Amino acid sequence: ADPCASNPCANGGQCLPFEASYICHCPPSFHGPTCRQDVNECGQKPGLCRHGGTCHNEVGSYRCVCRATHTGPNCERPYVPCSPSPCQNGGTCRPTGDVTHECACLPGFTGQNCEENIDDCPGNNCKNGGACVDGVNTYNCRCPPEWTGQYCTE
Amino acid sequence: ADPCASNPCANGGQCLPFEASYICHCPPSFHGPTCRQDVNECGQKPGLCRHGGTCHNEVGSYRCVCRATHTGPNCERPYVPCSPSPCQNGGTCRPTGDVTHECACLPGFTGQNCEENIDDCPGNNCKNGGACVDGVNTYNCRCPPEWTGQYCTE
Ligand SMILES: [Ca+2]
Ligand SMILES: [Ca+2]
Ligand SMILES: [Ca+2]
Ligand SMILES: [Ca+2]
């Protein structure tokens, strides 16, 4: 005799026997007789997304879409443009406003945040089937098993 | 026979014997026969203060006065307003521009960067010679040796 055998309480609801049937104790994220109805966290917890952010309800959670002036999962912290720095590949971040920034890239990279590595391979001198490998404003030839050299010619 | 006995080479210049006299080997910061003339680092090293900063020569060193857009001893890093945060006493920094900020103080503090602790002592109820001690939007009475209590009345 185990009415819970069937696993009726979903999404983490505890199942307990109750009279002829069972009974679900639901989690904070769901509700209903089986814990299969999503809780709208935005409506039950107003101001969940602080500092003017928009709350979007999800199934089993929610997400906050912050104003440009704030960040975090609930917009709790102000947005400081160059911390954490967005500029990848050792570029230099410079603030340009309250919510804006600008990246000064090292030679060899481009993009808004130094994200893309310029393809240095066109015009390479890798010979005898050696493959060209893009680098820090340069290239390297990966030679096949019967060649050595900077260009696979030795 | 020790011509250097007199300690003639100043500001860290090494003294060595040379002919009848001595001779000074000067440090980078000074020059002259005794290392007593200051070196003007600004003029001998141009661009010492990076990103448009002004170099002011000092005796035995120099100092850089940066543009608002940069910081460091030589203006090498850009200025990021809320990192390191200026707001003292657990206040919240909010950027308001490229080089400007604003602090949201916790209750009990005021000033541009939450620096001053509001004097909560006027109107205190510290009795029997007990001194008032300002606090986190509150006060405490430091009682004399024959009194106890929140107000020194027990
Ligand atoms: Ca939800
Ligand atoms: Ca490259
Ligand atoms: Ca100097
Ligand atoms: Ca106070």
Author numbering:
A (entry chain A), B (entry chain A): 141 to 294
Provide the authors' original text about this structure.
The Notch receptor is a key component of a core metazoan signaling pathway activated by Delta/Serrate/Lag-2 ligands expressed on an adjacent cell. Key to understanding receptor function is structural knowledge of the large extracellular portion of Notch which contains multiple repeats of epidermal growth factor (EGF)-like domains.
We report a crystal structure of EGF4-7, where the domain interface formed between the non-Ca2+-binding domain, EGF6, and its preceding domain introduces a bent conformation to the region. Each domain within the construct displayed a canonical EGF fold, with a single Ca2+ bound, as expected, to EGF5 and EGF7 (Handford et al., 1991, Mayhew et al., 1992, Rees et al., 1988). An unusual tilt angle of ∼80°–90° was observed at the domain interface of EGF5 and EGF6 for both crystal forms resulting in a bent conformation for this stretch of EGF domains. The EGF5-6 domain interface is stabilized in this orientation by packing of the side chain of A208 (with some contribution of T209) in EGF5 with V239 from EGF6. These interactions are very different from the interdomain packing typically observed in cbEGF-cbEGF pairs, and EGF-cbEGF pairs, which involves a conserved aromatic residue located between the fifth and sixth cysteine in the N-terminal domain packing against residues on the major β hairpin of the C-terminal domain, resulting in a rod-shaped conformation (Cordle et al., 2008a, Downing et al., 1996, Hambleton et al., 2004, Smallridge et al., 2003). H210, which is located at the position of the conserved packing aromatic residue in EGF5, is instead involved in an intradomain interaction with H191 that helps to stabilize the loop containing A208. In solution, the EGF5-6 interface is also observed to be bent but is somewhat more open (70° ± 2°) than the crystal structures.
